[PDB]
Design an enzyme around this catalytic site. Structure first.
Site, PDB file in Angstrom:
ATOM      1  N   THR A   1       1.652   4.888  -2.418  1.00  0.00           N
ATOM      2  CA  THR A   1       1.470   4.293  -3.775  1.00  0.00           C
ATOM      3  C   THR A   1       2.256   5.038  -4.833  1.00  0.00           C
ATOM      4  O   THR A   1       2.410   6.253  -4.769  1.00  0.00           O
ATOM      5  CB  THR A   1      -0.007   4.326  -4.229  1.00  0.00           C
ATOM      6  OG1 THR A   1      -0.808   3.569  -3.319  1.00  0.00           O
ATOM      7  CG2 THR A   1      -0.152   3.730  -5.627  1.00  0.00           C
ATOM      8  N   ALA A  49      -8.140   3.007  -1.581  1.00  0.00           N
ATOM      9  CA  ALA A  49      -8.299   1.671  -2.136  1.00  0.00           C
ATOM     10  C   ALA A  49      -9.729   1.456  -2.643  1.00  0.00           C
ATOM     11  O   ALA A  49      -9.948   1.233  -3.833  1.00  0.00           O
ATOM     12  CB  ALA A  49      -7.959   0.642  -1.089  1.00  0.00           C
TER      13      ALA A  49
END
EC number: 3.4.25.1
Lengths: 212, 250, 198, 233, 241, 244, 242, 244
Positions: A1, A49
């Site tokens: 990410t 997440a």
């Protein structure tokens, strides 16, 4: 990410990638790493997440309660501290999150807060968070000016995430853009790296290595 | 179930009196007389063994109890209350003192502990004050011999000599006449025996009277030898025989 | 670790604290103020574990301010330091201890003397002419052991630090991005905005 | 007399009565009427919903506890919510743990026992509501009458509430008739509406005023209100 | 363990314990507060049932919850402490989490909630106290003045008073306070405050303390003289007629 | 249930008064009088022992003057046993403060804490209040010599001179009559004895019926000294002041 | 004495009934539901000219689609509003949707009977019932605009129009005649302003009375003094018209 | 004075506990039920008043089983009786779990006894409004018991409680005299049916329903079972016949 947020003349730019992985497995190329806390508060997500999605969505609920209770919009500082203080209560338990709380209040003006699961809370003008942060920093740092155009700033942000999506195996998919002005955030699209890369390559002449 | 009595049973009346403490004191007034006299080298506490039936064995009922090897107690009022108070007093002497400092508590502090226990039964929820008045006599290295009185309110005071119960007023007066700061222990034991005779209706001998002293160390009552610093308990209960001998010189 | 230094001169206590905040491979911020003002004449610097660091500082700040308002009085530096030591001493034997080291510099208006206290996360307190936490002490204690004098003026004190900071910038492996210096004296706490080149 | 022994449920009167419980029962009588009756294939609940103003709604009186069980209330609404919720859990537990639908007879026992506790301990108050439970289990159609006293009874039919006595006598009369209405729900319902009207007096059961519920052989407990009951008025 | 319901409804719909809590306030010494155009002033009277006190140490009637907010009260002294302490703690907690000092309305809403809660919790009696809370919201200059009572109800006033004879002094303020032109000065605001207290204090230079609160944590209490001066100039306004 | 036997020690009267507090004070009014006088160079604490006998051991006795700290002491008026409970918790609070800040507890902080404990038995718990009123006499480096007084309600105040117990009204007028801000410890010692001498419900004011204490800053030292007078010492100061 | 959760011989809960008495002494509150939104109005009723009337908050926001008005011991309503707000926000966190108006009301009423000194049913720690009634008005996709009356009895009714407080019996009678299924939002506003005026001891102006509504489009809004002032003018005019 | 009857654990001046006595009234006001001890088991039977034709016949059962060998029947406040059985069931489960062997009747009796006596010790609870007849077959024989609201209980040859306890006891006494050798399970079931029919006269106004159950070493293998069908009708008739 890879996620970034930076303050400049025209407010704040917020850009994130949209890849999700479980090892080398690309679980998703279409994930939302930016939650619109409310018309004027954005939250970036990096790390686990579930941890991000859950706690930041919860953050939003807390901000809404602040407003019903105080008949006033929560401050970027207070909102970020709610998350920070929550995350600190869980310190050591294994929560994994690198976040950015970005907003605009009449009282604080453009404001950005870095908050991670270690309990670290920092106020600043430029932040890149995630496995691809260093890549974004390289591009963003070498082209930043407080006096960029809302047009140019948006592009640098977009270009910075692109850079990261390219070099970081754990970042990719598409770029989600946001512009923060006192009238709130303004979504500026979802750019698939699959097409954005080649376009930028041609029009910019960079990524000169790769063969096209 | 569950003790739902979490409020006080002793409260202030418009006049400022605490009824239950007053009533407790009244219970003490009805009790058999007991007293204590402090001498220069010892203290004596005594009382009447008011046997409740000639079939009962008065020995199996000690009104005079040892708390620590240098501290004893006697009372006037509700016997059962006194009993549990002695159990608690013996235990607090350990929990709050011997187990911390490795030595028994001085008379004033143990008295203070007992007094605390009684004060609480005056304010805690769901209980009534203790219906007794105690007379504790003891000795400690830095305070010498002492004699204390602890009332149902939890108040206590040191005495040279005093009496509680039935004919306390009369006995106190008789003591004021015979007491002086030069009395030897035997003298006090004698004065004690005399005061108690005025309070006893029937038989007056070593079987109807219970008397104990805090005096010299009784190495013969220690149970072991080999440790110079351990000389024995100062608390000794007089035997029926020892009493009678002193009664013939009454 | 971070640089946390403190030096007590004639009429004041000077606190120098590194400005960098590094996490892993990146230097996230270079203007971090590792200090909290506990009372008008008491300043505390801190370094240690990521979250515990500020959480602790602000917690102590809150308590001292509460004391100040309740009593309408300012606890002496010695009293504030004793309170902090006990807090850390409780912490060390708790489920998750605060891993924080601190320097408490305050001017005692009643004694009219500056004071410097060094306290580590175990609740170890000691009063000193000069102190440091972490690896800094390894190069600054002998420096100060050499160039330090009790009668030094605040100005000589700042020169002394500059000397410490230079040694730290020459031999320390990390780039701590300079320091923020603050002065605590009879007139309160003020910051020396010009140390980037003094 | 009574005044000295009705201070709380933990006090017996000199004649062996528990006034607090009796006063609870009194809140039921003051409650709107409701009727229950069953054949061998179905069980029906007919209830008269009461309204405050003509600007207010007619408070619901039927609550579903599970696909095969449900009840009607007369008295303190909140207390019925509490009790029905408890019954919903007991039903729920039976399925999740034993994969077994709760027997209507057992539901009654559980309700009795829950009510009983609030009549032997200080501080509490009896439930102030009556309940009529219907359901279809492994032994057919069932109808139960629940009283705050803790007493639960299985009947062919019955009624509780104000003037409930009318409908009750009617059913005690119609007994042999409705008990045989097997395989025909509309007939049992009609037989119920006829029993309930035997307790009217004030008005006549309208559309947003009548409430009916049914359960049976191949019918999951379902509530009918308004337009849905129009065809029965 | 103890949870008896002490504050309960009576047939006419009153909670007698809360009502009697107000009677405790009626008995307390008077207290007043008038807001100027750039300040708020809090006046309180001093009893005289016994005089030989040490004013240095004897707890004052006006307390600082934070550096920009004050709280005065009428009623049971012992009870006020409990509220003041909680208020002070909440003040710090708020700075710690919101990173901004409390607003006067917030601090007021909080004190009121504590009072309300004590009216419907078992085993406790209501606070026999009414408060006047005043100050300036952070970075704001518009003066704030609020009042709370045993019931837990609170609201803002241009000027208000509580305590014994508060009836009298309210009248004074009602026909002596113009919302159109609030005491445009700290001086004329303090004056209007002493005047209202003189309506009940009956000559008491040492029986009247005053505190002035200005924007940005600017709080100070007047000394006997300063006050005595206002009394003096006031008695002349009368005689000069 | 139990509700039947609950006195409800913590409720308001229709006049907004606390029954138990009012009745506890009534109790306090019959307690031996205790007086506190604050001078420029010290504080004086004098109390009258309620009830005594020839046989009462006065040497080993104490029922009114207790040492809380080395710089703070109290004079008691009311249930001695109730007092001891509060005195002990007060002594612990002083030590927690010391262990925490390495500084002796400021007088008011200790007084406020004790008063808060009392206030508590006033608002919750259903227990009776403590039948006690204290006169605190202490010294600290922020306010110097201080005199305070607290009662069952939990309210406390500061004074130059004050009394608690029986005949306070009489004693206060006598004190408010001869007290002077520039007094001296020795003057206060005398004022105190005179006051008690005139308010006593007894025949004469003898030493066996008194407890005396002074907190002075012995010039030849620089520190504060507490002195709890011994029988003989009270007997002396009694003759000197002219009470023989 | 006698249990706080005791039954009267008529089958009523003393504390709840006495509770209702307190509410009758409260300031009037009126609510009108129309296919264009629900209107909520209340009587400020300041107790002295020195009291800054706009600090009187008797109409509050539960959520964007739910508003509420109170009458009676208003301090008792704070914890109720808090519970309601939290309930609404919590529902949205768990289900990503607005909470239904009926559901929110049922949730608030669940607190109602939770009082006593040891009632065997859970842990109802609250020494007495609430001394305040609430009018909860809102809108949801399933049952459109709704108005509820939540009492300390735990029961809650749905009304087309409802009035609570000192002038309720009077005002309710008024509402009986004036309300019809086709009222417009404006008609309801004026209607509420009118009925308040009849029951209020004080001459209704834009300072001792406050209006508010809840519409699917803009949600719950509290009318500012200026907006209401004109509505008041518009009312005096239409009245003098005949 | 008076009022000794308003709180449950209070001793009246004559040493009684009126609340328990009032509980008894609730029992006497209830249906009649009995128990007959036979030569190798016990029989239980009870009166079930038919309020109306609406009561589904045979459904509202009253006799309750504890474990697999104990039977319990009671008169008075039915809900209280269920409560007491629920307890007995736990009490039994607990016993079996630790000792393996199902609980002996005497042992079970005391379990119920102590629990009931417990409800006469505090004013925060109400005594049980039921007298209970229970029993079974264990390691050494059959046992019949009856427990009062006072917690008192004894072993019985025959026992009855409720409305017609007198008729019943009268009948039971005859049986005891006319059968010193011991009745049989089969015989007791009939005898039981009759005694209920007889004892039903004290309530002859309302129609009733009979309910019998038994536990016989030979007839039921020592397990409690309800008398149904033919055996039931046969006993119903034996009664209907001797009632005329």
């Amino acid at each position: 990410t890879t996620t970034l947020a930076f303050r400049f003349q025209g407010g704040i730019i917020v850009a994130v990638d949209s890849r999700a992985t479980a090892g080398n497995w690309v679980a998703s190329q279409t994930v939302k790493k930016v939650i619109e806390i409310n018309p004027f508060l954005l939250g970036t997500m990096a790390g686990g997440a579930a941890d991000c999605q859950f706690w930041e969505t919860w953050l939003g609920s807390q901000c809404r309660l602040h407003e019903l209770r105080e008949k006033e919009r929560i401050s970027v500082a207070a909102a970020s501290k709610i998350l920070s203080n929550l995350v600190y209560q869980y310190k050591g338990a294994g929560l994994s999150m690198g976040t950015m709380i970005c907003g605009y209040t009449r009282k604080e003006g453009p404001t950005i807060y870095y908050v991670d699961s270690d309990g670290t809370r920092l106020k600043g003008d430029i932040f890149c968070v995630g496995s691809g942060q260093t890549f974004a920093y390289g591009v963003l740092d070498s082209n930043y000016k407080w006096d960029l155009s809302v047009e140019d700033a948006l592009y640098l942000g977009k270009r910075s995430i692109l850079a990261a999506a390219h070099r970081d195996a754990y970042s990719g998919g598409s770029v989600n853009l946001y512009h923060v002005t006192e009238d709130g955030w303004i979504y500026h699209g979802n750019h698939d790296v699959g097409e954005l890369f080649w376009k930028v390559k041609e029009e910019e002449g960079s990524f000169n290595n790769v063969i096209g | 179930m569950t003790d739902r009595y979490s409020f006080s049973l002793t409260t202030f009346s418009p006049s400022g009196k605490l009824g239950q403490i007053d009533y407790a004191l009244t219970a003490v007034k009805q009790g058999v007389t007991s007293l204590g006299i402090k001498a220069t080298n010892g203290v004596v506490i005594a009382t009447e063994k008011k046997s409740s039936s000639p079939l009962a064995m008065s020995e199996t009922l000690s009104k005079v109890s040892l708390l620590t090897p240098d501290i004893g107690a006697v009372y006037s009022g509700m016997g059962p209350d006194y009993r549990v108070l002695v159990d608690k007093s013996r235990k607090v002497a350990h929990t709050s003192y011997k187990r911390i400092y490795g030595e028994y508590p001085p008379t004033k502090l143990l008295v203070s502990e007992v007094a605390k226990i009684m004060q609480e039964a005056t304010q805690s929820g769901g209980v009534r004050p203790f219906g007794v008045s105690l007379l504790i006599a003891g000795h400690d290295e830095f305070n010498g011999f002492s004699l204390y009185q602890v009332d149902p309110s939890g108040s206590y005071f040191p005495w040279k000599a005093t009496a509680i119960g039935k004919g306390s007023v009369a006995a106190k007066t008789f003591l004021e006449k015979r007491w002086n700061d030069e009395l030897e222990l035997e003298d006090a034991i004698h004065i004690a025996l005399l005061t108690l005779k005025e309070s006893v209706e029937g038989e007056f001998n070593g079987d109807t009277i219970e008397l104990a002293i805090i005096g010299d160390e009784n190495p013969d009552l220690l149970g072991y030898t080999g440790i110079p610093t351990d000389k024995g308990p100062r608390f000794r209960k007089l035997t029926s025989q020892e009493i009678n001998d002193r009664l013939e010189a009454l | 670790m971070d640089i946390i230094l403190g030096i007590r001169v004639q009429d004041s206590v000077i606190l120098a604290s590194s400005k960098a905040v590094t996490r892993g491979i990146s230097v996230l911020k270079d203007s971090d103020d590792k200090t909290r003002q506990l009372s008008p004449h008491t300043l505390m610097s801190f370094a240690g574990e990521a979250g515990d660091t500020v959480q602790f500082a602000e917690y102590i700040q809150a308590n001292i301010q509460l004391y100040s308002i309740r009593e309408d009085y300012e606890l002496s530096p010695q009293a504030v330091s004793s309170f902090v030591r006990q807090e850390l001493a409780k912490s060390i034997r708790s489920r998750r201890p605060y891993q924080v080291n601190v320097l408490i510099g305050g001017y005692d208006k009643k004694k009219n003397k500056p004071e410097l206290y060094q306290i580590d996360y175990l609740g170890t307190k000691v009063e000193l002419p000069y102190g440091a936490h972490g690896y800094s002490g390894f190069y600054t204690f002998s420096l100060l052991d050499h160039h330090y004098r009790p009668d030094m003026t605040t100005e000589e004190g700042l020169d002394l630090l500059k000397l410490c900071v230079q040694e730290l910038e020459k031999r320390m492996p990390m780039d701590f991005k300079g320091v923020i210096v603050k002065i605590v004296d009879k007139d309160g706490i003020r910051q020396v905005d010009d140390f980037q080149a003094q | 007399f009574r005044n000295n022994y009705d201070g709380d449920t933990v006090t017996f009167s000199p004649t062996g009565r528990l006034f607090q419980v009796e006063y609870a029962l009194e809140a039921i009588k003051q409650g709107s009427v409701t009727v229950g009756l069953r054949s061998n294939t179905h069980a029906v609940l007919v209830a008269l919903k009461r309204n405050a103003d003509e600007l207010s709604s007619y408070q619901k009186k039927i609550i579903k506890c599970d696909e095969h069980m449900g009840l009607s209330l007369a008295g303190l609404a909140p207390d019925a919510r509490v009790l029905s919720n408890y019954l919903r859990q007991q039903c729920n537990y039976s399925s999740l743990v034993f994969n077994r639908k709760l027997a209507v007879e057992r539901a009654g026992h559980l309700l009795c026992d829950k009510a009983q506790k609030n009549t032997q301990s200080y501080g509490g108050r009896p439930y102030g509501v009556g309940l009529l439970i219907i359901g279809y289990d492994k032994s057919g159609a069932h109808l139960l009458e629940f009283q705050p006293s803790g007493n639960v009874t299985e009947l062919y039919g019955t009624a509780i509430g104000a003037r409930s006595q009318g409908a009750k006598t009617y059913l005690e009369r119609t007994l042999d008739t409705f008990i045989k209405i097997d395989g025909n729900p509309d007939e049992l319902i009609k037989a119920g509406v006829e029993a309930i009207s035997q307790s009217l007096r004030d008005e006549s059961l309208t559309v947003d005023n009548l409430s009916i519920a049914i359960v049976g052989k191949d019918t999951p407990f379902t509530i009918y209100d308004g337009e849905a009951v129009a065809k029965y008025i | 363990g103890y949870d008896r319901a002490l504050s309960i409804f009576s047939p006419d719909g009153h909670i007698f314990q809360v009502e009697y809590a107000l009677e405790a306030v009626k008995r307390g010494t008077c207290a007043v507060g008038v807001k100027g155009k750039n300040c708020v002033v809090l006046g309180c009277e001093r009893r005289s049932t016994l005089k030989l006190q040490d004013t240095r140490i004897t707890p004052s009637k006006v307390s600082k919850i934070d550096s920009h907010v004050v709280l005065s009260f009428s009623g049971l002294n012992a009870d006020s402490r409990i509220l003041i302490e909680k208020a002070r703690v909440e003040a710090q907690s708020h700075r710690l989490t919101l990173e901004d000092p409390v607003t006067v309305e917030y601090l007021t809403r909080y004190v009121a909630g504590v009072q309300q809660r004590y009216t419907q919790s078992g085993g406790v009696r209501p606070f026999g106290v009414s408060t006047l809370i005043a100050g300036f919201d952070p970075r704001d200059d518009e003066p704030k003045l609020y009042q709370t009572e045993p019931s837990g109800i609170y609201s803002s006033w241009s000027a208000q008073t509580i305590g014994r004879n508060s009836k009298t002094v309210r009248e004074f303020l009602e026909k002596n306070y113009d919302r159109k032109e609030p005491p445009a000065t700290v001086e004329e605001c303090v004056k209007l405050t002493v005047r209202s207290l003189l309506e009940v204090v009956q000559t008491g230079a040492k029986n009247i303390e005053i505190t002035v609160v200005k924007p940005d944590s600017d709080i100070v209490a007047l000394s006997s003289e300063e006050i005595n001066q206002y009394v003096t100039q006031i008695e002349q306004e009368k005689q000069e007629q | 249930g139990s509700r039947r036997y609950d006195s409800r020690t913590t409720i308001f009267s229709p006049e907004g008064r606390l029954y138990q507090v009012e009745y506890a004070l009534e109790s306090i009014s019959h307690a031996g009088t205790a007086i506190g006088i604050m001078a420029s160079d010290g504080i004086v604490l004098a109390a009258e022992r309620k009830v005594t006998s020839t046989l009462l051991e006065q040497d080993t006795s104490t029922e009114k003057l207790y040492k809380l700290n080395d710089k703070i002491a109290v004079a008691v008026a009311g249930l001695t046993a109730d007092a001891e409970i509060l005195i002990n918790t007060a002594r612990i609070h002083a030590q927690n403060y010391l262990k925490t800040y390495n500084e002796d507890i400021p007088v008011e902080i200790l007084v406020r804490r004790l008063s808060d404990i009392k206030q508590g038995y006033t608002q919750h718990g259903g227990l009776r209040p403590f039948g006690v009123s204290f006169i605190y006499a202490g010294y600290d480096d922020r306010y110097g010599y201080q005199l305070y007084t607290s009662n069952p309600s939990g309210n406390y105040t500061g004074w130059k001179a004050i009394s608690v117990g029986a005949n306070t009204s009489a004693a206060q007028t006598l004190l408010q009559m001869d007290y002077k801000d520039d007094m001296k410890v020795d003057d206060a010692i005398e004022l105190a004895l005179k006051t008690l001498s005139k308010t006593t419900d007894s025949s004469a004011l003898t030493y066996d019926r008194l407890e005396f204490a002074t907190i002075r800053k012995g010039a030849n030292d620089g520190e504060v000294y507490q002195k709890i007078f011994k029988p003989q010492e009270i007997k002396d100061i009694l003759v000197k002041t002219g009470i023989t | 004495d006698r249990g706080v959760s005791t039954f009267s011989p008529e089958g009523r809960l003393f504390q709840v009934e006495y509770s209702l008495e307190a509410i009758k002494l409260g300031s009037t509150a009126i609510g009108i539901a129309t296919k264009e939104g629900v209107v909520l109005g209340v009587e400020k009723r300041a107790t002295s000219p020195l009291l800054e009337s706009d600090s009187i908050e008797k109409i509050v926001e539960i959520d964007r689609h739910i508003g509420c008005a109170m009458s009676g011991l208003t301090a008792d309503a704070r914890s109720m509003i808090e519970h309601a707000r939290t309930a609404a926000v919590t529902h949205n966190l768990y289900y990503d949707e607005d909470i239904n108006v009926e559901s929110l009301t049922q949730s608030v009423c669940d607190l109602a009977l939770r009082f006593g000194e040891g009632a065997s049913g859970e842990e109802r720690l609250m020494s007495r019932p609430f001394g305040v009634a609430l009018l909860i008005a809102g809108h949801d996709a399933d049952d459109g605009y709704q108005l509820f009356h939540a009492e300390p009895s735990g029961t809650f009714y749905r009304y087309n129009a409802k009035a609570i407080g000192s002038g309720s019996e009077g005002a309710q009678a008024e509402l009986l005649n004036e309300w019809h299924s086709s009222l417009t939002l404006k008609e309801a506003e004026l209607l509420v302003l009118k009925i308040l005026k009849q029951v209020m001891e004080e001459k209704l102006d834009e300072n001792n009375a406050q209006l508010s509504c809840i519409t699917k489009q803009d949600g719950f809004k509290i009318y500012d003094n200026e907006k209401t002032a004109e509505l008041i003018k518009e009312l005096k005019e239409k009245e003098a018209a005949e | 004075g008076t009022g000794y009857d308003l709180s449950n654990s209070v001793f009246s001046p004559d040493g009684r506990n009126f609340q328990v006595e009032y509980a008894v009234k609730a029992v006497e006001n209830g249906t009649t039920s009995i128990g007959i001890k036979c030569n190798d088991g016990v029989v239980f039977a009870v009166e079930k008043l038919i309020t109306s034709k609406l009561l589904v016949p045979q459904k509202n059962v009253k006799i309750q089983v504890v474990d697999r060998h104990i039977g319990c029947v009671y008169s008075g406040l039915i809900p209280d009786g269920r409560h007491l059985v629920n307890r007995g069931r736990e009490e039994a489960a607990s016993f079996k779990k630790l000792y393996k062997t199902p609980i002996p009747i005497p042992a079970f009796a005391d379990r119920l006894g102590q629990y009931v006596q417990a409800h006469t010790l505090y004013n925060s609870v109400r005594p049980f409004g039921v007298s209970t007849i229970f029993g079974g077959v264990d390691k050494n024989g059959a046992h019949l018991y009856m427990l009062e609201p006072s917690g008192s209980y004894w072993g019985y040859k025959g026992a009855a409680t409720g409305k017609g306890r007198q008729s019943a006891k009268a009948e039971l006494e005859k049986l005891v005299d006319h059968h010193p050798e011991g009745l049989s399970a089969r015989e007791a079931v009939k005898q039981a049916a009759k005694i209920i029919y007889l004892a039903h006269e004290d309530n002859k106004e309302k129609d009733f329903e009979l309910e019998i159950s038994w536990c016989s070493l030979s007839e039921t293998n020592g397990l409690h079972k309800f008398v149904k069908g033919d055996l039931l009708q046969e006993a119903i008739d034996f009664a209907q016949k001797e009632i005329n």
